[PDB]
Design a protein around this ligand. Structure first.
Ligand SMILES: [Zn+2]
Length: 46
């Protein structure tokens, strides 16, 4: 049947880090670059 969960193919990428989506990685990767080094704003936990 499905033999693979593939939607339309608009935003196959996602920044789990925050929970966003992107059309292509090239764009996401960069968006994740800023994410790096997540400092504890409130609750000190990883
Ligand atoms: Zn993100």
């Amino acid at each position: 049947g499905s033999s693979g969960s593939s939607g339309s193919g608009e935003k196959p990428y996602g920044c789990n880090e925050c929970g966003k989506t992107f059309s292509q990685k090239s764009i996401l990767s960069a968006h994740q670059r800023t994410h790096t080094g997540e400092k504890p704003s409130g609750p000190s936990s990883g």
